[PDB]
RNA sequence: UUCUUCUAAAAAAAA
RNA sequence: CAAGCUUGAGUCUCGUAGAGGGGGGUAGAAUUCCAGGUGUAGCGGUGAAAUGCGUAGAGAUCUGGAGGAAUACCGGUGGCGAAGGCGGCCCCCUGGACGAAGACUGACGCUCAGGUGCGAAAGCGUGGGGAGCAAACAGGAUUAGAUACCCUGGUAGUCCACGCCGUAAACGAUGUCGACUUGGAGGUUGUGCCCUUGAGGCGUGGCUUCCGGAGCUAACGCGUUAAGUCGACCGCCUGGGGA
């Protein structure tokens, strides 16, 4: 999983109040970070389906959160996908 | 009647051969939990310790291998 | 199961001690178990059946302890 | 997920009556307290009471007559999978008028007989007899 | 990487190429090239001593360092190159003192790696040490047969040998043929297998592909006449005799090794 | 970094080489910004069963905190050192420092 | 330890 | 449609248990083979035999070596996983679940035709590996016959890397999610309080086994892990054979 220091750095960068850890921007950033960190792992271990299931769960969770955000405030969603480099 | 939960030890140390010898038979086999009365968690820890000791040649796998 | 005969000890009691040690260590049962191959489904079903009997006998004894026969 | 709190309320009432419970408790709502008020003024439940501020909990004191329960049949009619709406001239008479049918009209939620007297139909929430 | 060609024409329909993106796409090293003239399978008397050889694309000889005597001087791999003289690829390495040489390419060798020979070299793929200091059980390649002569065993695309035992001045190697052979402990060897392991997976596809490598066609004995081969003759297809070479020696099973000088080093024959 | 408990057994004929081996390994650990939390040479000991047709071995226990990129190459040095007979590198949750039960 | 098979038609009581 | 709220859902801090998954090493027992020492007329197998292995020295026993597969004991109606399934030990990468205190976002939720992924064993392709077991096959028995059950051998296969196939009594013959309804004895895993006055007592969570009340069910049974009382969505059935 992600390190404590990495999560702290991410929540400091994206958190409005620097102590929240639950806002949609922070959660999407954490999921995105974990997915990118797992890119190297699944490139080497292509047969780890049991972990790929968890990865797909993260992906679907992030998709639902991004859909919710885009429905609620288009501006924050646009800024977040620009900062994280997500195509959609 | 588990000795490990009585002393409240955090984890069983594989180097503690003196205590480990009391939970193995003369043939080198592991004595069952239902006989010695050890709690399941400590039983698993004890099994792991016994295997680690066997790998480290501190305990015999069997009584006959020479 | 090593048994070394001690001084001033009869052979028959030594043989009995060796037999007792052997049945304690379970070598005969182990060899008879490994005489032929047992499928994983068969051994699982056998262990399940054994547990069912080992629980049923206890419950049967508990019920029989209450009532009388005459 | 929990997608029908009204059905959940009816189910709690039915189970409590079957299990001989004196009172039942459930999370409140303005519609639940309204149906509870209708049941109390119609003599199906003894009294209702709502406590709490942020998460208000409604408590219904059930009613028993001659050992057995009073409400012997209670069922949701318009459920989220299939809504049922009926005009005032074709309202149903539950148990030949002895039972009642909780119907939600424009002037609040009331019984079927009251709705017929007042001359307006509505959504049929549930039958209770 | 093996790729399967699309069937846009017969002769290409069944081709499977083995592309290697790491190979140098240029000309080979000039101070190490030298002439390699063809022979047609003909000896100094001009007679064909081995049939089905002749033609094929022109090739130049790359002076590969088989002896590997530059001891103690580390070398960095400049680039990998294709070698037409052998099945395996070769690597152009540069020593610290500025001398470039060609070596066989191991399995995991990429550009920029460091290799070294000698008695005190580290144990990692590509280093060359005498096999008495190399741990037992390890798979090595480009192994010598006599001390200082240069590698002769395990030299093709994806071969290797395993050092299975050592007893005094000799070690016992399990050769790629499945045969156990003794060899002196002072012979050098390079750690790890040799690189182009997927070379056997390629299929030539057409007759011309074999013609490009100087391999002339092979005529079956039964298709000839009795004066040409023992198997020749017959009104139709007839083969009523035990299979033999064109000079009358049996092929299906008959052993032909007659070297009593080197029998003492063969611990156990192949299977 | 990560806490490791290393225990290796070396051939009894090399009993005089064990101080020097201890110095080299500790030097590597410290040079790689590591810590040595305990080091107990258990000396020679009788084996429970004969390993490589010899019945005695010199045991050494060492508790280290070091990066895995120095620990793996240490395992390689063990693998290629013919003097050492076995080596168990176990990873522990925290640094433990109490004396092992075979010093008494 | 082995030990196979017997086709094709039945009838049944009603305070 | 707009503004909210924290109970549903999710995130962070500290821990816990686990054969959860992928990659690479390593340890021991045993089977088979090879070489040698001792030793002689049987071994192996069966209900009884015979094929087979033995005077060219087998079987037995000891030593050394090669190779492959699987991890006794622990081991448990025990644990983990969505299911298939996962069992020596060590390291690297990694998924999920649960507990105690808070803090945070604020319905972001549940199900899902078509679609996508995972999916035992057997089987297929390419390249390895092959000790034991063992479809096909051969020989020996039993029998009226024996293309079988039993015996001696034995090839694909079982093992490794990457793809294909996508099927099982793939079973709890019980789709997923949520709410409510008497209880008892355990197993396993956290955690709070009282004097841990020893392995004591009193709660409160997760998973799981057996018995049983109301209720349901054609009955057998299910019975807070429902097949009880309800709500949301999906797939499926309309006599047997044909199929």
Interface mutation vs chain C, best among B25, B27, B28, most C CBs within 10 Å: B27
Interface mutation vs chain F, best among B7, B10, B14, B15, most F CBs within 10 Å: B15
- Looking at the structure, do residues E150 and E64 belong to the same domain, yes or no? no
- Looking at the structure, do residues E9 and E70 belong to the same domain, yes or no? yes
Nearest by Cα to E219 from E82, E51, E86, E98: E51
Q: Is B27 on the interface with C (CB under 8 A)?
A: yes
> In CATH, what number is assigned to the domain containing residue E245?
4.10.950.10
* Residue pair D123/D84 in contact by the 8 Å Cβ criterion: yes
Task: Name the DSSP letter for residue E223.
Answer: G
Cβ-based burial of C44 (10 A; exposed 0-12, middle 13-18, buried ≥19): exposed
> In CATH, what number is assigned to the domain containing residue E105?
2.40.50.140
Residue found under tokens 């008397």: E45
Residue where a domain stops, chosen among E95, E113, E131: E113
Q: Give how far F54 is from chain B: nearest CA, Å.
A: 10
E198 CA vs H50 C1’ separation (Å): 53
- Looking at the structure, do residues E104 and E127 belong to the same domain, yes or no? no
Nearest by Cα to F57 from F101, F96, F18, F20: F18
Token couple for E126: 């590509």
**Inter-chain touch F100–B61, beta carbons under 8 Å:** no
Cβ neighbours of residue A31 closer than 8 Å, sequence gap 6 or more: A58, A59, A61, A62, A65
C-alpha distances in Å from residue C11, one per residue of C22, E82, E150: 16, 81, 71
Cβ neighbours of residue A58 closer than 8 Å, sequence gap 6 or more: A31, A34, A35
Task: Name the DSSP letter for residue D95.
Answer: G
- Looking at the structure, do residues E47 and E15 belong to the same domain, yes or no? yes
- In chain A, where the domains are located: 1-88
The dihedral of CA E84, E87, E91, E95: what is its sign?
negative
* Residue pair D117/D98 in contact by the 8 Å Cβ criterion: no
* Residue pair E100/E30 in contact by the 8 Å Cβ criterion: no
C-alpha distances in Å from residue E259, one per residue of B23, B25, F16: 64, 60, 50
Cβ neighbours of residue A7 closer than 8 Å, sequence gap 6 or more: A21, A30
Quote the number of domains for chain E: 3
Q: Is F62 on the interface with B (CB under 8 A)?
A: no
- B17: chain F residues, CB-CB within 8 Å: 101-102
**Terminal CA-CA length for chain C:** 49
- Looking at the structure, do residues E96 and E133 belong to the same domain, yes or no? no
Interface of F with E in 75-104 (CB under 8 A): 80, 82
Note down the domain range covering E188: 117-194
Rounded (5°) CA angle E215-E219-E224:
155
Q: Which nucleotide is nearest to D25 (CA to C1')?
A: H180
The distance of Cα E255 from the centroid of its chain, to the nearest Å, equals 23
The CATH-assigned architecture of domain A1-88 is Orthogonal Bundle (1.10)
Q: Strand pairing partners for F40?
A: F61
Residue where a domain stops, chosen among E176, E194, E212: E194
Buried b (16+ CB within 10 A) or exposed e, E146-173: eeeebbebbbebbbbbbbeebeeebbbb
The distance of Cα E211 from the centroid of its chain, to the nearest Å, equals 20
Torsion of CA B58, B64, C4, C10, to 10 degrees: 140
Cβ neighbours of residue E28 closer than 8 Å, sequence gap 6 or more: E60, E62, E81
* Residue pair A80/A25 in contact by the 8 Å Cβ criterion: yes
Phi, psi of C4 (to 5 degrees): -105, 120
Interface mutation vs chain C, best among B26, B29, B31, B34, most C CBs within 10 Å: B26
Nearest by Cα to E125 from E111, E150, E106, E112: E106
- This entry's atomic model was obtained through cryo-EM
Residue found under tokens 């005799």: E241
Q: Strand pairing partners for E162?
A: E139, E174
Distance CA D8, CA E113 (A): 71
Token couple for A75: 């501006």
DSSP characters for F25-59? HHHHHHHTT-EEEEEEEEEEEEEEEEETTEEEEEE
- Domains of chain D (ranges plus CATH)? 1-71 (3.30.1370.30), 72-129 (3.30.1490.10)
- Looking at the structure, do residues E100 and E149 belong to the same domain, yes or no? no
- Looking at the structure, do residues E159 and E227 belong to the same domain, yes or no? no
Cβ-based burial of F65 (10 A; exposed 0-12, middle 13-18, buried ≥19): middle
Distance CA D77, CA D85 (A): 10
Distance CA D76, CA D96 (A): 18
- F80: chain E residues, CB-CB within 8 Å: 123, 135
- Looking at the structure, do residues E171 and E99 belong to the same domain, yes or no? no
Count the alpha carbons within 13 Å of C62 in the hemisphere toward its beta carbon: 6
Distance CA E228, CA E249 (A): 15
Cβ-based burial of A19 (10 A; exposed 0-12, middle 13-18, buried ≥19): exposed
- Nearest-by-CA chain C residue for B25: C25
Nearest by Cα to B49 from B26, B30, B25: B30
Q: Is F91 on the interface with B (CB under 8 A)?
A: no
Rounded (5°) CA angle B48-B50-B55:
95
Q: Count of B–F CB contacts within 8 Å?
A: 34
Nearest by Cα to E103 from E91, E115, E89: E91
Torsion of CA A11, A17, A21, A26, to 10 degrees: -50
Token couple for B17: 């051969």
Give resolution in angstroms. Answer: 2.8
Contacts 24+ apart (CB under 8 A), D6-13: D6/D31, D6/D32, D6/D35, D6/D76, D6/D125, D6/D126, D7/D76, D7/D79, D9/D35, D10/D74, D10/D75, D10/D76, D10/D126, D10/D128, D12/D60, D13/D45, D13/D60, D13/D62, D13/D71, D13/D74
- Looking at the structure, do residues E142 and E88 belong to the same domain, yes or no? no
- Looking at the structure, do residues E200 and E231 belong to the same domain, yes or no? yes
Q: Strand pairing partners for E188?
A: E130
Distance CA B26, CA C4 (A): 13
Q: Report the SS3 class of residue E50.
A: coil
Inter-axis angle of helices A24-44 and A49-72, nearest 10 = 150
- Nearest-by-CA chain C residue for B29: C25
Q: Strand pairing partners for E2?
A: E18
* Residue pair F4/F64 in contact by the 8 Å Cβ criterion: yes
Distance CA C22, CA E255 (A): 57
Phi, psi of E16 (to 5 degrees): -135, 110
- Looking at the structure, do residues E24 and E104 belong to the same domain, yes or no? yes
- Looking at the structure, do residues E11 and E91 belong to the same domain, yes or no? yes
Q: Is F54 on the interface with B (CB under 8 A)?
A: no
- E123: chain F residues, CB-CB within 8 Å: 80
Nucleotides of H under 7 A from a protein CB: 5-8, 10-14, 16-23, 25-30, 34, 63-67, 72-78, 81-84, 88-96, 103-105, 107-110, 117-119, 126-129, 133, 162-163, 177-182, 187-190, 198-199, 209-210, 213-215, 228-233
Q: Which nucleotide is nearest to D8 (CA to C1')?
A: H179
Distance CA E149, CA C26 (A): 62
């Amino acid at each position: 999983s992600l390190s404590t220091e990495a999560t702290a750095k991410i929540v400091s960068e994206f958190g409005r109040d620097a102590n929240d850890t639950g806002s949609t921007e922070v959660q999407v950033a954490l999921l995105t970070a974990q997915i990118n960190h797992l890119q190297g792992h699944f490139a080497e271990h292509k047969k780890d389906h049991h972990s790929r299931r968890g990865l797909l769960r993260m992906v679907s969770q992030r998709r639902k959160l991004l859909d919710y955000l885009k429905r609620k405030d288009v501006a924050r969603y646009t800024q977040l996908i620009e900062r994280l480099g997500l195509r959609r | 009647f588990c000795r490990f939960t009585a002393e409240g030890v955090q984890e069983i140390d594989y180097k503690d051969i003196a205590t480990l010898k009391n939970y193995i038979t003369e043939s080198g086999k592991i004595v069952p939990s239902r006989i010695t009365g050890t709690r399941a968690k400590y039983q698993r820890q004890l099994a792991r310790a016994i295997k680690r000791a066997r790998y480290l040649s501190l305990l015999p796998y069997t009584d006959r291998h020479q | 199961p090593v048994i070394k005969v001690r001084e001033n000890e009869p052979f028959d009691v030594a043989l009995r001690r060796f037999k007792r040690s052997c049945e304690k260590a379970g070598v005969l049962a182990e060899v008879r178990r490994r005489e032929f191959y047992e499928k994983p489904t068969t051994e699982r079903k056998r262990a399940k059946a054994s547990a069912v009997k080992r629980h049923a006998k206890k419950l049967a004894r508990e019920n029989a302890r209450r009532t009388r026969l005459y | 997920s929990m997608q029908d709190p009204i059905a959940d309320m009816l189910t709690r009432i039915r189970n409590g009556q079957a299990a001989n419970k004196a009172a039942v408790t459930m999370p409140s709502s303005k519609l639940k307290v309204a149906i509870a008020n209708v049941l109390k003024e119609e003599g199906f439940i003894e009294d209702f009471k709502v406590e709490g501020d942020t998460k208000p909990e409604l408590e219904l004191t059930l009613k028993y007559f001659q050992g057995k329960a009073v409400v012997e049949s209670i069922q949701r009619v318009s459920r989220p999978g299939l809504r049922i709406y009926k005009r005032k001239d074709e309202l149903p008479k539950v148990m030949a008028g002895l039972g009642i049918a909780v119907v939600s009209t424009s002037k609040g939620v009331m019984t079927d007989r009251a709705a017929r007297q007042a001359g307006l139909g509505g959504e049929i929430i549930c039958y209770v007899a | 990487a093996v790729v399967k060609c699309k069937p846009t024409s017969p002769g290409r329909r069944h081709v499977v190429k083995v592309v290697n993106p790491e190979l140098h796409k240029g000309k080979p090293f000039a101070p190490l090239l030298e002439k390699n003239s063809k022979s047609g399978g003909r000896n100094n008397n001009g007679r064909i001593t081995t049939r089905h050889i002749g033609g094929g694309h022109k090739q130049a000889y790359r002076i590969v360092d088989f002896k590997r005597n530059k001891d103690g001087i580390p070398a960095v791999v400049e680039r990998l190159e294709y070698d037409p003289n052998r099945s395996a690829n070769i690597a152009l390495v540069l020593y610290k003192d500025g001398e470039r040489r060609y070596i066989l390419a191991p399995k995991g060798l990429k550009a920029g790696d460091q290799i070294q020979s000698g008695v005190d070299a580290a144990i990692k793929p590509g280093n060359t040490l005498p096999m008495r200091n190399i741990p037992v059980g390890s798979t090595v390649h480009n192994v010598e047969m006599k001390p200082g002569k240069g590698g002769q065993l395990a030299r093709s695309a994806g071969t290797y040998v395993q050092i299975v035992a050592r007893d005094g001045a000799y070690v016992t190697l399990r050769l790629r043929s499945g045969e156990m052979r003794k060899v002196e402990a002072d012979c050098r060897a390079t750690l790890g297998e040799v690189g182009n392991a997927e070379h056997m997976l390629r299929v030539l596809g057409k007759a011309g592909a074999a013609r490009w490598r100087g391999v002339r066609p092979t005529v079956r004995g039964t298709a000839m006449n009795p004066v040409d081969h023992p198997h020749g003759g017959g009104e139709g297809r007839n083969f009523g005799k035990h299979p033999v070479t064109p000079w009358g020696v049996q092929t299906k099973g008959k052993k032909t090794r007659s070297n009593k000088r080197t029998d003492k080093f063969i611990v156990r024959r192949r299977s | 970094m990560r806490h490791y408990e290393i225990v290796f057994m070396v051939h009894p004929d090399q009993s005089e080489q064990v101080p020097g081996m201890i110095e080299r390994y500790t030097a590597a650990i410290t040079g790689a910004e590591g810590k040595i939390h305990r080091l107990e040479d258990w000396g020679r000991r009788q084996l429970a069963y004969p390993i490589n047709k010899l019945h005695k071995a010199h045991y050494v226990l060492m508790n280290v905190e070091a990066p895995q990129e120095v620990i793996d190459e240490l395992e390689t040095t063990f693998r290629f050192n013919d003097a050492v007979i076995r080596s168990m590198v176990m990873r522990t949750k925290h640094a433990v420092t109490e004396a092992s039960p075979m010093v008494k």
